[PDB]
């Protein structure tokens, strides 16, 4: 529906069958059979129609971007990623919306891979992860459920990065907010678990983190720049 069906299936076929071996083939297929002008749309297709739903192939799709070696395209993909994360983060949330949360998680994982994993920062003007967590904390369980798993997924990609790998001060700043949320008595079972798992993935001892007293600022919580709806 975003592209006329002929041009649509043409690029659907590039990513339809993708592998380690046919990688360089498919990257040339794309470079020739598709016009440069459609690349912003190829970038939407990749983020929305593939990456969002199939987390099993994120390494492949990342290898693709690597092989393609196109920075202006890589930039498009990063903006598309942020745009969609925004839509979901400012959506009408409901207990029932499992699908929306799944998409946000995958888009989180993907964001980690194309920024952190590649020694590039998640810019404060694009996304303020620390404030997202605190805002989630004041708005409710629902918002937390939408946000903690999502933040976990993006941080998973810090271990693979000489820059953000612990004990990076930003990475550890985020981890310390999570460590404080984990101390909260009425934090859903599944999110205490999600946070625990994240520590093991980063080879961290949850108990050695240094929780702060941010959740008690109140005055600060009242003045956050909202990133949620």
């Amino acid at each position: 529906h975003m592209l006329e069906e002929n041009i649509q299936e043409k690029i659907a076929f590039i990513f339809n069958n993708l592998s380690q071996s046919n990688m360089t083939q498919k990257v040339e297929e794309l470079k020739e059979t598709v016009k440069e002008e459609f690349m912003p749309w190829v970038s939407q297709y990749l983020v929305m129609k593939r990456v969002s739903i199939e987390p099993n192939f994120h390494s492949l799709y990342s290898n693709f971007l690597d092989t393609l070696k196109n920075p202006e395209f890589n930039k498009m993909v990063l903006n598309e990623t942020y745009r969609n994360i925004k839509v979901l983060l400012t959506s009408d949330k409901a207990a029932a919306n499992f699908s929306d949360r799944s998409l946000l998680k995958n888009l989180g994982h993907w964001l980690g891979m194309i920024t952190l994993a590649k020694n590039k920062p998640i810019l404060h003007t694009d996304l303020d992860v620390k404030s997202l967590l605190l805002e989630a904390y004041v708005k409710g369980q629902q918002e937390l459920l939408y946000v903690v798993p999502f933040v976990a997924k993006v941080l998973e990609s810090s271990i693979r990065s000489v820059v953000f790998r612990p004990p990076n001060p930003w990475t550890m700043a985020i981890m310390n907010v999570l460590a404080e949320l984990h101390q909260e008595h009425d934090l859903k079972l599944n999110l205490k678990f999600e946070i625990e798992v994240l520590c093991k993935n980063l080879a961290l001892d949850i108990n050695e983190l240094k929780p702060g007293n941010l959740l008690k600022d109140k005055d600060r919580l009242k003045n956050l720049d909202e990133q949620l709806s």
Binding site: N119, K120, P121, I122, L123, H124, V163, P167, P169, W170
Partner: protein, 264 residues
């Protein structure tokens, strides 16, 4: 209002501004102040090829930064309206920390308020956290201007990595290039400018520059560094600098091959 003084209480507030000027002003001129040098590394001899770095590492791991000064500029050497230079003042405690006696006296003479630093100084790890995601580091497009600055970047790397510096000089540059893709060390460039020699203040005088603010403080030094670059670029380099020739080479260290330490 040309040079803003930053402490703990107004760091968050000023980063908010820096976050924005970096977009339009991608040239960053920098200088630090710290308690000098107190030691020579054990087991290393001056004759070693990497001795200058090993001497840097030895003292940076051991001592705490006292001031960072950042001055923002653009392609043509213009400044943003209002403040163009921020002077970050870091937590420092003369009872607890280490220092070379002379440096504290010189820094004191220059106007450093050591008691205010002890009480209202910025924590360096919190400062790293905020710099990390501000566009001022790690991002392409930005360009760092410096002066005899091996030790300056050693502190910035120590702060951004929250770790001791890498054992080997090779490794220090690898991680250095990630945080700071493009660096120009005016004192390095000066090795190609007949009749330009000396410290920052001396070079400032030969180039007929007018220093704004207190000498031997970071903010003012960074702004003078900034001026010395854009003035030197037109006068000796025809308003263009060859990356392959000059980018990334810090004065006194092994890249671009004579003391790394900015003696007085």
């Amino acid at each position: 209002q040309r040079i803003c003084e930053v402490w703990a209480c107004n760091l968050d507030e000023e980063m908010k501004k820096i976050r924005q000027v970096i977009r339009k002003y991608n040239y960053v001129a920098m200088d630090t102040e710290f308690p000098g040098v107190v030691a020579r590394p054990i087991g290393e001899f001056r004759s070693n090829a990497d001795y200058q770095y090993q001497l840097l590492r030895c003292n940076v791991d051991l001592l705490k930064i006292i001031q960072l000064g950042l001055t923002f500029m653009n392609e043509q050497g213009e400044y943003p309206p209002g403040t163009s230079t921020w002077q970050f003042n870091f937590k420092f405690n003369l009872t607890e920390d280490m220092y070379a006696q002379d440096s504290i006296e010189l820094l004191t003479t220059s106007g450093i308020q050591f008691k205010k630093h002890e009480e209202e100084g910025i924590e360096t790890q919190y400062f790293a956290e905020l710099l990390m995601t501000s566009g001022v580091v790690l991002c392409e497009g930005v360009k760092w201007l410096s002066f005899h600055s091996g030790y300056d970047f050693g502190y910035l790397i120590k702060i951004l990595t929250n770790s001791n510096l890498p054992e080997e000089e090779l490794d220090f540059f690898e991680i250095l290039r990630l945080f700071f893709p493009v660096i120009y060390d005016v004192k390095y460039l000066m090795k190609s400018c007949k009749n330009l020699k000396g410290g920052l203040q001396e070079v400032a005088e030969q180039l007929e520059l007018e220093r704004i603010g207190p000498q031997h403080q970071a903010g003012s030094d960074s702004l003078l560094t900034g001026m010395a670059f854009f003035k030197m670029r037109e006068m000796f380099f025809e308003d263009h600098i060859d990356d392959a020739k000059y980018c990334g080479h810090l004065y006194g260290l092994g890249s671009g091959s004579g003391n790394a330490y900015e003696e007085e």
